[model samples]
Every structure is written in C-alpha cells, then in structure tokens.
Target chain A: PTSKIRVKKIENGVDENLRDYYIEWQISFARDGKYDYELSRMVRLAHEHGILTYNDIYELLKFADDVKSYLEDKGIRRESTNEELYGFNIYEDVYPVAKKELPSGEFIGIVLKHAQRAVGYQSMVYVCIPLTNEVPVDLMKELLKAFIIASETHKNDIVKFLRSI
Target chain B: EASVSFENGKIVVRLPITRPTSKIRVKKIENGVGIPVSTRKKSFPSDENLRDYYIEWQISFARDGKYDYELSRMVRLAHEHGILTYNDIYELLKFADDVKSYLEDKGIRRESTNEELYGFNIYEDVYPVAKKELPSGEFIGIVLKHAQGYQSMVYVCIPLTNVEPSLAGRVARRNEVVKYEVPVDLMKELLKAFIIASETHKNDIVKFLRSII
Candidate 1:
C-alpha cells in the first residue's frame, strides 16, 4: 500500500571534469519485499518522467525476471558479486533524448552507471555536477517517492483527462 | 433419348432420356468422382518444443518503445483468449505484407449479417496463418496453435514508418541534431535517462488508456 525510499551513498570518485557520485536508493513497498505488479508499474512510470522536481536523475532498478531465469535454467549460478559490476560503462546505456535546454554553466550533467539486482534491485544514478550545486539528495528522495505515488494513483484519472483532451 | 425395355427377359437402365409409361427422363449421370482435396495441410510444432523460441521472441519485444503495444497485444491475447495456432501467429506477424494479399487472393465475400460493408470474416474458409522457414532448420516467423474461436477485440498493430510520412508529411520534421559541448558520455547518459523515463511514462499512459473498455 505504501512505499518508503531509503537513500544511502555507496561511493564517489572523480574523472577529469566530471564527478561520479554513486548513491543506492532502496524502495521496499509495504508489500514487504514481495512482488507487487501495480507498485512496480508505478515505480517504472515514475522513472519514465525523466525528471524529478530538482532533476537528480531517476532510474527504476529492477531485476529482469527472464534474464535471471534464463541464466539459472542453464545450470549457471545466479550469484552476485562485485565482479559482476564490470558489465559496461555508463556511456553504453546513454542515448540522447533532446538538446541542452539549460543556460550555459547552470547545468549539472546526469548519468546512469548501471542497474543490477542487489538485495532487492540496486541501481546507481551517476550525478556529474560540481559540489557547488548541493546535489539536492533529500529533495530528490522526496520528489521521486511522491512521483511514484502520484503516477500510481492518478494514472487512471490522467488517462481519462487525456482522452477528453 | 434412350429406350429401355424388357428385351429377351432382361431389363436395362437408360441415360439422358428414358421411355416409360409417363415419360421418365435423365439429364446426366457420372460415377467414381473423387472429392476435392485441400492445397495445403495444417500442421504445427509442439508447444513444449516451441516454448524456448516463443519466450525468447516475446522477450525481444519487451520494454517500452515502438514494439510495446504489439507485444502487449500478443501477451494479452495469449493470456486472455488463448494461444494462437502456429499459422495464426505467422499471419499475425506478417499481416502488413502477406495477409493483405492473402485476404484479397482468397476472395471472401462480405457477410450480410455484419455491419461493415467491406469486411469479410477471416475465419470463414481460412484463418490467417503463415510460415517461412530457414534453410538451417530454423523458423523466424510467428507460430501458434489452436487459435480459440474468433475474438471480439481487435488489436491495431501498425508500424509508423510509412504512414507518418505518407499521412502526415507536412507535419514531419527532419529531427535535426543539435551539437552540445558537454562530455560525450555524460550527454549520452543524460539523454538515455530522459529517453527511458519518457518511454516509461508513455507506456504507462498507453496501458492505462487501453485498460478501459
């Protein structure tokens, strides 16, 4: 019925002009770690909006059931380790959505490092901005949670309204 | 006309015409005629054997993008109405190409009971199903078995490639690329994040609207 967003910093590093601030945000709905398709849909829909209120970046971290089953079905172990992190660089998953809209020097570049199933599913949202912007960690956590709830609740109403439009 | 009579203690039957007390007649007669045979035989692979391929194919169409609705329609049908026969699946996947021609070639007449003036029942003489196999014993086309009786619901699965240009050419833009001085990887990730998020939202809205009757 309800979900809580828990944010914990995992690690951070620097590469030339960009800083990779990796944070792991966990969400366990009141369903108690059980699979809730509706909740999952809500979370996924929220991630699709592309922007949180302050725009800290959002990615719905979920384990792909098919891929997991396929690997295990072949007698391969479905174990997780740090070694599995070597999958691909963030650039691999990056695709352009639109041109830059922010004025010069006012934008903090956002990136997605990787998403993997850890504990529940864990995804790393890589924020590449100067420390001067304050990162808005708490602001993002609140906004992201609210977005999922709103999407889940008002999705039907939104559809009805859109149809009328 | 042929005449038949009790000649030499034997009676014979006549064809084309016969003479009788009241003038019996025979227009024509033939014997040993064979039944018309079907041009193609109906057969399909086993579900157990096909599970892997079907699952893989289904997954390939997963995620929120151009193929989302197509895949969703298939999954919903399979889960709701029933699994389609292999031929039905093939017909479904290639409906854009082979199906239109197949329908015309079959020359089915419209049903008087139906409301549509130009509509013909696909299930009348032939349920739409097709198959194309590879030389290496692989099949790339769709396959399903025992399509449950015709469904009332219709799924519109059209590729926008041709229609977007043909139907709305004046509204079409070149999708010009804008250069940004941002780091390539950051720009890519930034764009990817937005793309994924937007697609997810679009899928949700579409699914929601679709859920309604």
Candidate 2:
C-alpha cells in the first residue's frame, strides 16, 4: 500500500494541470526502469488530492478485465506494451472527467533517455502547466511563456543558488 | 385497393412497391466516367455484403458546452417519445445509404494503424461513450447506427473535418470545424427523414448532412 521512501510535501504552489503534465510524464510512465517509480509517484499525488479511494483502485482492476476482451475481439494474441495501452492514458483510463483535469503531484519526473547528438545522455526538461479553473488566463499564459523562455533561460541562476545555500 | 376476389375476366398486375437499394452511388461532381470496375480481383464487396456486424458500447457527454447540450436536449425531446408515421421502407433505403457512405470517410474504416487510428464502431452503442470538442463549437458522436446493429466503444478522435458554416449556413463557426454525434434519441429524426423521402432520391437534404460530414 505504501512505498519505502519517506516523503513529505514541500511548501510550494506550482500552477499546473493534470493532463498538461500527464501528456509529458506519460513518457516516463511508458519507459522501462522508471515505470514503477513513475506509477507510484502518480498514486502518491492522487492521494495528495484526496481523490484516490479503495473503490477507485478496485474499479481500475475491474476495468482491466475489459482489456482482455478488447484484444480477444481482434484475434490479437499478445500482451499490451506500456505505451500501447488504452487504459494507460489518464483520460482514457480514468472515469468521467474534464479535458483539463487536475494533477496528482508536483514532483520531479526522471527517466533514462537515450544518449544522442552528444556522447552520453542529456538532461532534457519538460514543463506541464496546471489545469484548474482557479488559474487565471493571463497568469497561466505568462507561466506557459515562462516555461518556454524568459521562462527557462535563467535555469542556472536558481540551480546555483539552491546548491550553494 | 384492388382485391383478389375478382372474377376471371378481370386482369391483374402486381408490382413491387418497396424500393431496395442495391449499390453505392456518389453524386457526379464532374459527370463523365465510363469504365465500370468489377470482377473478382479488382472489385470491392457490395455494401450489402459489407453490412457490418457490431458490438455494443456506450459513452457519455458533458452537459457543458451550449453547442452539445442544446442539440442533445432536442434529441431527448423529439425521439424519447415514440415517433410513428408509418415505417416507409423506400424512404429509409435512400437515407441509410448516404449515412453508410458518410461513415466510411470518417475514421470509420475497417483497419487500424497502431494507436494513431485506434479503431471505431461504424455504427454502435445505445448511448455515446465520449463527447469531444472540435476547435469549432459543433460536436461529433459515435452511436448513430440503425441499418444493422453496429457498435463499438473505442474512442474516435480522428476522421474529423471542418464543417463550420454547414452548407445550410448554421451549426459550427467558421474557424473551429465540427464533430457530429448521433445519439439514440436523435435516431427518430434521421429514420423518419429517410422513410419520409422518396425511398430513392439523390436527396440533397439527406446529402445535406452527408455534406456536413
């Protein structure tokens, strides 16, 4: 039911949406090695929202049964790959919800990326904006712009301060 | 009404009253073709044979947007109550034909290409399984089958096209395009539209919605 890692919520508020972040985090969820941690990360976040329930996890299991029938109907005899699952997509799997759904947690998502162009791997970053009605249009727009540029350009400034202090 | 109880001197001729549609016919946009493609290898099966078998699935739509609820309520009103004005077979023939043709173009094909296509029920489900918004305000759905009992619950996000300024001028806006879902309650209007028309017409009215597709 719980993981070995002892974690506590940090005092911070990040404006973001579930789907916006999910569309990106799904990458980690879809990858190898990181799948378990990423899934647990999502579960803990949902608990933070107080939305996770025994019934929910129960319903999830029941729904997985349909996964079998769906494949059988097509004569497709194989197990579904991580990325090739209908239920993996939050919107696709989660019960009736809005397009702009809320997120489980504001957490660091890490995964092994294939090393490219350079010699080894590169630490790439992706920003998923929050999707809540409370987020004002202007601020969210500004946040998105920030994520894109004058948004991320000064990445070293914050990193140096945190590491130094 | 002519009865069969007449004497021997009376002549009688019985003719077929119902019109059964046989083939798919697209309206001639330019109108000058001659070669007929048929035979075992190069030909496609008849639409009748291609009459699809279905699986039942369901979806729901939010009463969120004005564009969707406005129309779904109309369906609740007109179709929830029984619509009966005679089951005109001829009229239905023409109507469903076009609907069949229209279904083919929308992400409604028989094959799948990984997740990009996913798959769709050509005509399936008693209620809808999902409701999506096109940039334009109009909406599209996945449960409008009537000819046979086709069904599927798989989400259909592709096969959408711009339908603003619906040929008749109303429905979606100029920028956003549309997705039209046919709910069970709305089936009456469509079914009636068919049975009411001349069972065999190159009806623009029926084609109007077809064009909307």
Candidate 3:
C-alpha cells in the first residue's frame, strides 16, 4: 500500500536504535502534531552536537508546553475555529491506525515507552521543578541524559526483536 | 332538551328541538350518535376487542418494519458481494414500497413518512400495484399475525442459527447476546444502526467476522 512506510533505513546517520525509536515516536505522536516539534528540536540539537541525546527530545516536548503557556501568558487564546492545541494535531487523523495497530504487542511497547518518557518529564516539571527551580534544571539535564541511554537500549532490543520477526 | 347517557357499554343520546318554540322538546332516540353535535361523542371498544385488534395490527406492523429493514440490509449485503441481480434488486425495492403502503393504508402512514421506502419516500406512493397485491388482503394484518406466532420465531431463529460461532464470539465480547428474542422496536433500531454503519465500516465488520470464523 502507498500508505505503508517500510522502515528500510534511517536517514541522517541516526543509528538503528535511534531510527527505531524515531519510527515508534512518529507512530505514537502521529495525530497530535506535537511529535513533529520534538523531532525537529532533536534534529536541530543533533546539528549542534555530532549525536543527539535523550535530553534534546525531552527539551522539545517541554518546549511544546512552554509554547502554550507563553501564548496564554500573552492573553492569546487559540482562534475559536482552530482545533489544534499545539504541534501537528495528528490525533484525529491517526485514530483508526492507532485503534487497529496499537493492540499489537510490539507497537504497544513503543507507545508505552514514549508515554513513560512524557510522564517522567511531566513529573519533573510538576514535582521536581517546584522544590528548587535551579537544582531541578540541572537535575533534569542529567536525568535527560539517563533517559537517552535507557531509550537507546530499548530501541536496540526492539530492533533485534523486529529482525527476528 | 338534550341528554347523554352510557348504557350496555354504548353511548346513548337523546335530543329535542322544537319548531318556533322558546323551550326545547325531547326527540326520539337515535342509533349510535348522529352528526354535527354528535361528532363530539367518543366510542370506546371493549377491552378484549381492543386487545385483539391491536395485537393483530400494531404488533404486526411493528415486526413488519423490522423484517423490511432486515430485507433491505440483505439486499445491501448482496450488492456488496456483487451477487445482486437486477431482478433481485427490483423485487427487493418493490417489496420495500409495498411495506410502506401497507403501513399507509393502516393509518400508520405517518410513521413511514420519515422513513425511506424503496430508496424513495412513502408519499411517493410509487408502487400502487404492489400495494394492491399485498399477499394478505390487509397490509399489516397478515404480517403481524404471522410474526406474533411461529413465523417471527422462525425468522429470527434462522439468523441466530446461521451466524458463525466466531462472529458470535465477537458479538459476545461486545456484550451482545445472540438471541432470537429481540423486542420488535429494538430489532428495528438494530437494523437501522447496521444500515448506517455499513455505509463506512462494512469492510471492517466483514474482515472482523472473517477473522473469527
């Protein structure tokens, strides 16, 4: 099908691990449009460094919330007719695929991983940041590095499993 | 003089009108109620008669709508399968019109007004011959009698028996029971939902059932 994208090769020299993680990330964020910003941010950060780390991806998602708050703080609500909150707003478009494809065990694992990452970052903002703003910023930077390592390892495991299939 | 009285479960009336007289005079009793002022009289049928009439009529029309909807859905399915012949489609279309007319003649035409009849409206009254040739002289009369008895049981049971176990399992997971005892109104609603959903999700439903079977 023209619609189906086969993960033949990851571009930009992203390792097999990062590529699989990216694919999974794309699928998870397919409908919301926020994932594109995350992807764009990661790509930009990668340009700054020879390789992109998990901290870059985390910062991008955090940046999404920051954008919304900046708009709100400026007394700017989204245009009433416009449905999007932020990002690409892929939720409605990918609903059918999500309902059909997410039930698969492999797909479920990827979705869960991204969800965990999102929650972990959210917790740092809500719980950790309130305690000590400066300390939390430094701690989040270190935690993002740890997240990158964990995600990379998970992506490698998935690639091996997918290849077996 | 004018008087109203109830006797022997019938309304009896007495009216008196005199010519060129200031006072009224009582006139002889009339059979049932007469015209004009008599139009205000209300007649109540005996409980047994009302029950028997409605059971034979109302219940039949109720079940007939379900049957008609099912038949329409079957035609739709056949079209999807590419097995529907011109003759098959024609007859099914004719039958749908006939069903609407039957309801019309029975004073339930109002119900058929909003519903599509053979892809047309009931007001179209499109198939006069089909309406005249209703298998039973009385349109809804014949169908209701059949539905109230063994025929409805048989008609509903056939689908229950023929549906695949795997499909039945899927229905079960959705908390749907595969019983032949659907209420007539519920059956109509179910048929309507199926028709609407089939417009988009027909292939999905077919594939889902195929997987289970």
Candidate 4:
C-alpha cells in the first residue's frame, strides 16, 4: 500500500482560520482512529487550483478515514507500506497564497497523492494502535523520523508559497 | 539583671536590663549628672549581692527653643541608633515642658501640631522624585578623592544587584558629582546664623529654611 499524506494550502481564508481548519481535520481524524490523508491532499490541491469550500472539506475528511480503515484491515501500517511515510500536508492554508497561477497542478496533485498514501499507512500504525501494546522501537523511531520529515516538508512548502506570493 | 532610676523634672523613669555578660558601650547620659564610678564607690559601698545598678545625667539648654529642638533631635537619633528607652522619652517630655514654659514666659507661641517634623512628604516630594528624569547627552558626575596614596574615584552605589553595567556607571557618576557635597564650616555658619536669626526674629528660621530647601 502506498502512503498518502500530503498537505496543501487553501487560499480562501486567513492563515489562522486555515490553520484551525487543518487542526480540526487532524483532530477529527485522530478522534476516529484514522489519519486525514485525503483532506490533507485536498488542501494541497485546493492551494494549486485556488478553489476550496466547506462542502468538499467534510467529504474529503470522511473518505480519508474510510481509506485509512481500509488500509488498516489489510495489516498495512504506514511504516511498512512506504505509502504513509515522508508525506506532508501543504496548502495555502499552511503556506501563503501565490499571486501567479500554478504552472503544474497535475504535478502538485501527484505529489500530494503520494504523500497522502504515506500518511494513510503511518496513521494506521500510530493513530489506530492502543497505547497498551508496545510498538517495536525501530518502527517508533521510523515513524518519528517520518513525522519530522513531513513537518519539515510542510514548512518548506509554506516558505515556497510565501516566496511565490 | 541590673536596675536604674533617674529623675527628670517631676517624672521618675526606671530601667531594668540584663547584666553585662560582655563589654558594653555607654552611648549617652540623660536626666541627672553622670555618676563617676570612682566617686560613687567613695560615697556608697557596692552591694555585690544586689545585682542591680543605677546612673543619672542632667542636660541643660540655653533657651526653650534649644531645649525643644535638641530634645526632638536626640529622640530621633536615639531611635535610629536603637538606643532609645522609656527613660529617654520621659526626660525628653520634662525638657519639652520646661522649654514650652520658657517659650510662654518669653511671649512666644509654639506650634503643637502633631505633623511630621523630618520625613518625606510623599505627596509633595516622593512623586517628584519618581518623575525626575536625567537629561540626555549629559556627562554623569564622578567623585575623586585622595584615599590611601592614590586618587580614588567612586561611582554610584546601588542597593540592588544584577543592574546593567551602563546604568550602574551612570548612577555612580551622577551621585559622585551631585549627591555628596557638604562643607563643615559653612554648615556650622548656616546653623549659627539660623539660630541667631530665629532668636532675634522670634520665629523658627531653621524650620522656614528647611521647608523651602
């Protein structure tokens, strides 16, 4: 299974509101024992398309949880699948909006898709697992590294967006 | 334990204290005259068993003004030095009454208001002190004096630690140049002049000067 964890900026609102929306999605997915991969991907795509809406956000979060559960049932943790590893959520919400039209929306979408798949896999191993069962130290380390990489990538994407803006 | 008694006009004040286990410095004498141990021993034999003692001193001022002013000054100084006693207050009261009578006899009216004589009036003085500002681009004053064999300079002294070095230097320099300047002879001349002027004018020139200064 491929990890699908990507972050994208949605340009419709203020940075604080967008950040709140991102946190809301993360918290909502975390509450349901799923990772919000598709929501993250949608945010990135929204930034590229310069289009976003409340309606699409609710749907994206719903599908992302479904896909996470689907992957979990296959005994595919993100660390093993490489699908949920090294994935970031990049959005105008995460980064500032650029004034120029994006040259490669397809390329950006692919990047988000790949990231979403990675986060989807990792979410299963970390988010879904009960804390009582000790996870393998190596897997924990790998997950930590991936999480850090994802965060860094997200930050870089914001910087890129800000530079473009 | 040791006990002492003294007569101050009509009031008699008694003081009792622990016996000297170590050396003690006798700072001041009040009430009756000082009783020299040599003279006291010659006149009265020591009762070793009685573990109690008494001494007395007398103080006289030239006039009511001198007595009243000095009494207050002594009381303040004693309190500051932690040497004040009930006996001190009693003797002060005696002299104060005498001074008041003397003033009355001389047809002078003393203001008996219980207002503070020598403390900061927070409303008038403290607020202004708080609002005081140092002018910018002015050099801070420094004090240099001959100490030991070399000329020594002291900057401002601060009570609190962890101040910025630059601020500390400024304070030191300002204090050195502004705060510590008093000529002994000039101060004496001013005090004498104030006393003479006050006596002749029948008004407290010292107090008037203090108020304005």
Candidate 5:
C-alpha cells in the first residue's frame, strides 16, 4: 500500500481538538499564504480536487525525500537559511521553491526547514517524518500529480495562505 | 546516593558521578549448595551500570578540569530548582554555558564532592529518577536526589557510544542518560518560555517556573 505523509498543525484550539499531528523540527514546510498555514492550505486544496486526504498527507510525510527528489528533477529550486556553527551545522533551513520555469510557472512556492527545533509562532504546521519508507509508487505519483494540479488552480489563494503563515 | 544540607542559608548538594554497587559476596558453598560463580546467570549490563563504569574509567580526564562537570552539575541544580523538564531537556546545556555565570554571580555556591566520592574501586553514588522510554527509541530522564522529597530532577542530552570528549557527558550521563525524543513543537514552546524568563531573578524564576510547570 502507498504510505501517507504525516502532517501536524501547530495550533491547539481551546477545546484541545487540534492535537492529532506529531511535531518533527528536523523538517518543515514554508510558503506564501493567508487563509491558513501552508500545509493546511495544501490539504484543503487537495481536498477540493478530491485527490488526497489528510490521512494521505500524514502518511506521505515519511516519503518527503521522494517528493523532494521528484520536484527537484522537475527543476524546483531549494533555498537555505544558511545557519551554521563553528564547525558543526546548527540547523538546515532549506525549503523547496516552485519555479516559474516549471510548466504554468504560477504554482506557489513553499519553504522547508530541517532544524534542531522548529522556530516561529505556534500558528504554523509541519511534517514529522524524514527517513524514507516503502510507499506504493503509484500512490505517490497520484498525490504529486494532484499536488501540482491543485497548486496551479489555487495559486493565488495559496500565495495568500503562505503569507498568512 | 546524593545529599543536601542547609549551608550558610543556601542548599548545599553533594552528588557523586556514579551509582554505588554492592560487593559481590562469595557464599560458603560447603561443596555444592550455592550457585557457582561460573554457573551463575550472567545478566546483561544496564545503561546505569555502564555509564558509571565509563566515568570511573575516564577519571583521568577530570584532571583537565572540564566544563561538562559544571554543566552537568548545573543541570542537577536546574532540575532541583525546577527549570528543566521533559520537554526542555535540550536547554540543560545552556543552563551550564549561558546561564551558569549569571546564577553564580547572584551568590549561588556549588562545591565539588570529595576525592573519596570518586569511583576508585568503588562506584560513586548518584541516584537518578526512574527511566522513561519513548516510542522513538530515545529516552528522556533527569537526575534525582533526596533533597526536598522527590523535588529534584536533572536532564541531559548526550549519546553514549561516540561519547563526546566532554566531562558534561559523563556527569550528565551519571544517572540515566539516553537519546532524546521530545517532539519538536513542545520543545519550541519551552524555548519561548525559557528565552522570555531567563533573567534568573526571583520574579523571572517564578515566571519561568509558572510558564513550564
């Protein structure tokens, strides 16, 4: 079966209803948005298109490297925060960016960071899995395909959502 | 084992770097009643035992006067004072490096355990809290003492195998050191609380305590 990615919200509602996700600071997603955090927006868009669900996103986090490789192969640029210590690398804050050269060139760009701990307000969310796992190849292909299509259709709102974060 | 006494109106804590082990007694067999030393079951070594043994072996490194000793000591202090917690284990290092001087300058006095406390053919006595394991495989723990009931707890983050050439690792590992598996978001929550209330003043200390507790 195709494994899903793990996605968690940074917010905890008053009723304590938003504790479903796990937190892994070693990696995160960043982008331009307004109505919600990047991950929330992505899920909402994917939902609107009926391609992937929150459960699918949660399981796919374990296969983030695969997603990154797929995107990189398509010419996505990875940016960095450039944080380093004396000889040791303090944190790795590199997020993938959607480039204009990729097809429609209007899909929103998102940031990903691999840090010792997550930084910023509690309003953001993140993916907790890093080490790759055996996800069904076909399932991941469908998710990625759905992701790009949704991004193209919801580019403007997603950009607003990214800014909100 | 650790002890705490009121010295000069301040709490004086005496902690050894290792746990004490009892002598292996040889039973009067009278031929064949007792289990033979050779035939007795050979149980596996525990992380607690191995940690003490490793520190006992590395006593020579102490002559160099390492920062880890102070760091580990500070972690104990922080735990006793209630600054360190399950979610805030990573900050144990900062309690030594960043906040040590500030606390010392405020008239906190820390003393070293005597030479006899060293594990010279005798493991030191430093009791830690019950070990708590995580699903992530790494564990989170803190040092414990009889001071003020179970009111004391110290935490540290250091791997055992590649033992960083730091005394803090040994000192911190004295009790129950293991890999950390705290969730990233929870750690960040403590991070903000720490950064906001690190002044070490009574009010700031109270604020910090309330924020985490």
Candidate 6:
C-alpha cells in the first residue's frame, strides 16, 4: 500500500468537533529528506540523512571537544568558543570512514559506523594487578601473557563475527 | 605423625601450607605464641601435653596501600542481549589453556579462593538496530555501551564530516559556507529547541530528522 504523506497541520478545528493537526519540529538536528528507511533510501548529504542521528551528534560533540582540548594542550589558541567548535562541522560528520571501494565510494562510513553501536555483542574484562615492587615481576609477566592470549583469541572471534553480521 | 627437628638453634618444622589436622591450625612461631620458645623453653619436655590451643590469624593486603578499582564493574548488564552460550565449556576453557599454563609456570597458585579474571567490553555487531534505522530507533543495543556509543561517540563505521550549518541569528557574522536548505537561523532555533525537547519529546527529533513510516 502506498503511504500517504504526513499532514503538517490541520486548519481551525480542535478539541470540540473534527480535530486538529500538529506540526512537530525540533532544532537539535535538521531534517534531511533523503533517508533510506529500508533496503533503499533518499538521503543525499549525510547530515540530512537519518543515518547520523542524535547519539552520533553527541560523539561529534565529544570529538570536537577532544580536538579542541588536544589543540589547546598543544599550545594552540582555540578561543574555546561553541561557535568555533560547531563551525568545525562537528555535527555534519563525526565517525571514522572506511575505504570500501564500493559501487559508491566513501559510503562505507554510512554503512559501517552509522549503526556501529546499534548493538553490543562483546565486552572487555580488566584484571587489576599492581605493578608495585610487592608484585613479583614474574607474576606480572604471567598476567601479561594471559592478556596477550585473550586479545588474540578475541581478535579471532571478531573476524568470525564480522563475517556473521 | 609429623615430627620436627631442631639443629643448632635454627629448626625445621613440619608445616603444611594449608591443613587443619585436628581442631587447631599449626604454626611454629619460635618467638612467641606471645611467649617465644627462646624465652620460655627452659623445659624440653617435648611437652606433647599442651592443651588444645586453636591458633589462627589473618593478614591484609590493602593495609599497606590502596588498590581501588571502579567504573568497569563486570556486571553483565546485557542479561538478555547478544549472549552466546558455550555448550562446549571445555572448548572455552581450552582457549585459556595457554594462560593457565603460564600461571603455573609463573608459580601462581590458588589462594583458597579464585582471583577475578580480567574481561572487557567490545561491540562486535549490531542486534536489532540497523544502519538505516539510526534516527528513529530506541537503540536497544549490544552493551551498556549501547546507551553510551548511541549517544556519545562517533561510531567507527560512519563518515567523518568536518563541518556544521552556519546561518544568521546574529550569534556571530559568518563565513559563508553553503547556505542550508532551511535557513540556518530557523534550523538553529529548531536544533536548540530539540536539545531542550528531545527528552520529553524524544520522537520529535526522530520525526523531524527522518520521515516517519
């Protein structure tokens, strides 16, 4: 069935007779008409695309903050202004990109990261062992060896999972 | 059935690392069970008739320093999320075979209780939320990091955009980039309201950001 376009608003009538329509809008993100809701889409530039959503913006904010502070740490004067940060396109694009030489290049970022954390399948385990003089170096070495094996095996599991997904 | 031999002042005692033969745990504290043998050893009775004395004590590690750990509590938050059972628990254990051997090689032993093993969180796949579903979805995800990566970090698979929408509300005079489709001023006001409103009005951001089904 063809879906009818959502009505932006209905005129005049309210609580009493026929009814009313609502115009819901918010600024946190601008609407992009070209969202591919399914096996296909209408998204053009990424910002307008639904792919980069709210949390993506948060990461962008954090990335900008990281960049700004990192710049400040390096003795660069970054006026520390919100405008300056936002002007940096912090919202427009914020995740890493992949070079999946696809039918359309650079779209891999949209494919991979847009829903990257959409689910979680793995977690990291940390064992706290002091590296103090009281801890025998040999003991530390054993722990390090343990972690090395876990890491490699984890890597192996991930490749299998990547293929699974 | 165990015996001790004293040679020249230095002595050897039959001391097991962990064993309570009778009602008492045994240890040879030559200095004192409060009274050192050196102080009260005038009798070589081998006494054998000392009343049943249960001697036990304990020591602490943090008495020396602080080893505080927090934040990454291995509390598996995703109880029902993406968990795979190891029907082959032996296979899982075997994977750590090398680490277990390394521990033995390093002379690490069980202290009556097992040490907590180290584990970490990683996002290897998406469950219900797919890429195109980004804007409107509730983001029921894989880890507690789901909530985090959902709202905090730029995910690994997305493109890195190095810009923003700049329009005039007299916030500041701007260097002209591409003037946005919906005047920057209107978008700014809307985005600001969205931030203020995304909570009680969560779906609004999703609604405006993407077309509703």
Chain A TM-scores, candidates in order: 0.19, 0.25, 0.18, 0.20, 0.21, 0.17
Q: Please give, for residues B1-213, the per-residue lDDT of candidate 3 as tens digits.
A: 223333333222222222112122111112311111111122323333221111011121122423222323333333444444455444433433333212112111112244221121222111111101112211111111112111210011121222123221111222222212222233232222222222222232233223222
Task: Candidate 3: give the clashing pairs.
Answer: A31-A90, A31-A91, A32-A89, A32-A90, A33-A88, A33-A89, B60-B144
What docking grade does candidate 2 earn? incorrect
lDDT, model 5: 0.29
lDDT of 6 by residue, B76-185 (tens): 11111212123222222232232221101111111221212222111112121111112221111110112311222111111001112211121212221221111212
- B15-110 per-residue lDDT for model 4 (tens digits): 111111211111111221111222211232233311112221121112365523322333333344434444443443333233321111112111
**Candidate 1 - CAPRI tier?**
incorrect
Q: lDDT tens digits, residues B53-89, model 2?
A: 1111122221343213222333333222423122332
Candidate 3 chain B: minimum summed lDDT over ten consecutive residues — where?
B124-133
Task: List, residue by residue over A60-98, the lDDT tens digit for candidate 3.
Answer: 345332321110111111121222211111111000001
TM-score of 4: 0.13
Tens-digit lDDT track for model 2 on A1-165? 033233222222215323332223321221343323433344444544655555544433333322322211221111222331111111111111001222432322212222332222222223233332122223222222221221122223222212321
Task: State the interface C-alpha RMSD of candidate 1.
Answer: 27.5
A1-165 per-residue lDDT for model 5 (tens digits): 123333444442104433333433221233442343434545455556756555554343333322322222222112223432211112111223321112211112222222211221111121233232122323233323323322322333333332332
**iRMS for model 3?**
29.8
The whole-model C-alpha lDDT of candidate 4 against the native structure comes to 0.23
Measured by TM-score, the strongest candidate is 5
State the lDDT at A150 in candidate 6: 31
DockQ of predictions, in order shown: 0.01, 0.02, 0.00, 0.01, 0.01, 0.01
Instruction: Provide the lowest-lDDT 10-residue window in model 6 chain B.
Output: B69-78
Better of 1 and 6 by TM-score: 1
Which portions of model 6 miss their true places by more than 4 Å? A1-125, A129-139, A150-165, B1-128, B133-213
* Model 4 misplaced regions, further than 4 Å: A1-165, B1-43, B47-56, B61-73, B79-213
Instruction: Enumerate the chain B TM-scores of all models.
Output: 0.17, 0.18, 0.22, 0.18, 0.21, 0.14
lDDT tens readout by residue for model 1, A31-149: 43332333333433444564332122312111111111111111111222222111111111111111111221222121111112111111111222333233233333432232222
Better of 3 and 4 by TM-score: 3
TM-score (chain B) of candidate 3: 0.22
What are the runs in model 5 whose C-alpha is more than 4 Å off?
A1-70, A73-94, A97-165, B1-193, B196-213
Model 1 C-alpha RMSD to native: 31.8
